[PDB]
């Protein structure tokens, strides 16, 4: 059996939890993942009641790992007040710039987050389960489903899963080119058989979500942290890490630095120490410019020692880590991130539709050295002016990084 | 227009995977764009009806997915990343080895129908810039001769 040709991303941990087997760039299949005491949290989480696994997932602050931090117990606490039928749904969309977080636990380790929907769904009363994947991780699409396959032999899915009374079934769909299908509600859509257009929301996908009914979407490193919770119970999992932001976390770091890859660390962890002691320091030890967090944020070299954590000053986001040092062209870069934008608003709302395109349109021109004094007032304008109306999170953050580099770096901006 | 038999048994398959029909659209059209290097515009209205839905449905579906492609057939697409990180660590040198081993540029067709440039948003392999795939492999670009005998494997 063959999967297509995947690039051996660089992994480390610090801690041997996500990454125990994802460290080594190659599947893991069942009878490996059984040998490190596979799915044994999941033959204990049947032996529990759905109510139990909620709070132990309450109680270990566990939190969304798909880029907004919502606590995760308490969305399936909201979804079970919910009458049925409900779904569960892994959300493997994976599209933001810099963000590889999910592909190497999906590839290298996807017995675990198996055993993490299983675990989910269970908690939820849920039946059916989706994985959405990318369409351009075809790898991962063919190793998850051969890895349901290997699940449902072993009696891990099917009816009566291990004579608990329980049913589940697992459906991978794939994605076809669209960065806003991992907005959980044109995720949804997509499910559905439609274009990807996000609804308005609320009504959260809890109340109302895959036709109509209690949806529980999930982040894939979110659910990759069930099976730790069950295994060794919330209180040793709350003593991972710091107090306050307990807990493993992926940090995809690329870009200028000399050991690019996915580092296993706790939260506590700062900016500077992902960059300098983990990721090995910068190519030729050149300066550190700015760092993108994925296409979100831009943090200047004076404010990497805030931690990679939840907290208001933290770095929060996916804990993408993209590392430009002093060559890097700042308003260069701006445009390959307007140009995301562009590629990527679904039109549904005009000042989106029309502010993505406009802003890498114009900064193309002021790039190239064509832009007019009008185009130049013009880029500002509709830089600022993405957001009204928007119905998504993409409308409102279209500007954001952009809009960073522009109050952060002036001098090179002037320069154009 | 009719489906071969070897591509209709692939779309029946998909169509009862999940729990409705309509959910296999996806899985339909990238089985079909593997089948003929592109998605024939006469393919639109025959997977309508085994799907259940109406052809203006398809159309939007098909329209609005960007890895789907109506006009260019290619039996491989290689996908370059024109994103940010594979802009810092060297998109333009991936280009200018292909424009100097294939002779086309993105968006372009070699003569022989063989391969497409498709430049593509961000594959998420970040950490191994800059990244294209031929057809769903996925690599890194390091050189000129590492690329020459990559696309070698492709007859
Ligand atoms: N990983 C990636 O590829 C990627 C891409 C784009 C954005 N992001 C992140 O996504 C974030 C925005 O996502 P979002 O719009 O889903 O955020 P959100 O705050 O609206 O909600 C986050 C999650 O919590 C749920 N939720 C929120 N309030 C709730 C409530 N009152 N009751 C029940 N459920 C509730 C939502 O349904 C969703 O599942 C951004 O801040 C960004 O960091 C990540
Ligand atoms: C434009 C857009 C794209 C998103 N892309 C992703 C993605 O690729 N993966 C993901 O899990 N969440 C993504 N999200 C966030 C989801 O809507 C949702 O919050 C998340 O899947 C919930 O899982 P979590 O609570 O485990 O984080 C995106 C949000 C927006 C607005
Ligand atoms: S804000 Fe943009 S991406 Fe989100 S629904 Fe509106 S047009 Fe689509
Ligand atoms: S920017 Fe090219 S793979 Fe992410
Ligand atoms: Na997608």
Redesign the interface.
């Known amino acids: 059996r063959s999967y297509?040709?995947?690039?051996?991303?660089?992994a480390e941990t610090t801690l041997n939890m996500l990454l125990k087997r994802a460290k080594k760039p190659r599947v893991h299949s069942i009878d490996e993942y059984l040998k490190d005491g596979g799915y044994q949290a999941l033959e204990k989480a049947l032996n529990m009641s759905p109510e139990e696994i909620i709070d132990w997932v309450d109680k270990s602050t566990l939190r969304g790992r798909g880029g907004a931090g919502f606590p995760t117990g308490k969305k399936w606490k909201f979804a079970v007040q919910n009458p049925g039928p409900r779904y569960f749904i892994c959300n493997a969309d994976?599209?933001?710039?810099?963000?590889?977080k999910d592909?190497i636990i999906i590839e290298r380790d996807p017995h675990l987050l198996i055993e993490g929907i299983i675990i989910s769904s269970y908690a939820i009363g849920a039946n059916?389960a989706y994985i959405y994947i990318?369409?351009?991780?075809?790898?991962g699409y063919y190793i998850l489903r051969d890895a349901i396959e290997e699940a449902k032999k072993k009696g891990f899915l099917g009816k009566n899963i291990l004579g608990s009374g329980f049913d589940l079934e697992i459906?991978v769909?794939?994605?076809?080119?669209?960065?806003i299908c991992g907005e959980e509600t044109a995720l949804i859509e997509?499910?559905?058989?439609?274009?990807?257009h996000p609804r308005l929301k609320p009504p959260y996908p809890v109340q109302k979500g895959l036709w109509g009914k209690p949806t529980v979407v999930n982040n894939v490193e979110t659910i990759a942290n069930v099976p730790f919770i069950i295994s060794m119970g919330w209180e040793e999992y709350r003593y991972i890490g710091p107090s306050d932001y307990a807990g493993p976390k992926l940090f995809?770091?690329?870009?200028?630095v000399k050991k690019?890859?996915?580092y296993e660390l706790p939260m506590n962890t700062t900016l500077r120490e992902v960059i300098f002691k983990y990721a090995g320091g910068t190519l030729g030890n050149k300066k550190v410019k700015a760092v993108?967090s994925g296409?979100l944020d831009c943090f200047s070299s004076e404010e990497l020692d805030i931690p990679m954590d939840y907290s208001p000053l933290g770095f929060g986001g996916t804990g993408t880590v993209?590392v430009?040092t002093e060559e890097?062209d700042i308003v260069?870069?701006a445009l390959?991130?307007a140009?995301?934008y562009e590629?990527?608003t679904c039109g549904q709302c005009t000042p989106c539709r029309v502010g993505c395109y406009e802003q890498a349109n114009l900064l193309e021109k002021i790039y190239k050295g064509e832009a007019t004094e009008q185009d130049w007032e013009g880029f500002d304008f509709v830089n600022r002016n993405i957001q009204p109306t928007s119905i998504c999170g993409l409308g409102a953050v279209a500007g954001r990084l952009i809009r960073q580099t522009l109050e952060k770096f002036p001098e090179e901006w002037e320069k154009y | 227009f009719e489906f071969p038999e070897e591509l209709k048994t692939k779309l029946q398959e998909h169509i009862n995977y999940f729990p409705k029909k309509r959910q296999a659209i996806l899985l339909c059209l990238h089985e079909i764009q593997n089948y003929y290097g592109y998605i024939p515009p006469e393919s639109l209205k025959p997977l309508a009806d085994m799907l259940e839905l109406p052809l203006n449905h398809v159309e939007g579906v098909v329209a609005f997915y960007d890895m789907f492609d109506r006009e260019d057939k290619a039996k491989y697409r290689i996908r370059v990343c024109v994103s940010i990180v594979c802009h810092l660590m060297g998109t333009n040198k991936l280009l200018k080895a292909l424009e100097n081993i294939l002779g086309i540029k993105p968006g372009e067709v070699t003569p022989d129908g063989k391969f497409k440039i498709v430049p593509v948003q961000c594959l998420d392999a970040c950490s191994e810039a800059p990244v294209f795939m031929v057809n769903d492999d996925e690599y890194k670009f390091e050189s000129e001769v590492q690329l020459n005998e990559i696309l070698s494997r492709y007859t």
């Open positions: 297509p040709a995947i690039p051996r991303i660089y994976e599209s933001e710039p810099g963000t590889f592909r059916e990318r369409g351009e991780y075809p790898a459906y769909a794939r994605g076809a080119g669209a960065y997509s499910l559905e058989g439609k274009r990807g995809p770091v690329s870009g200028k690019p890859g996915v993108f296409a993209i430009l890097d260069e870069a390959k991130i140009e995301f590629h990527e």
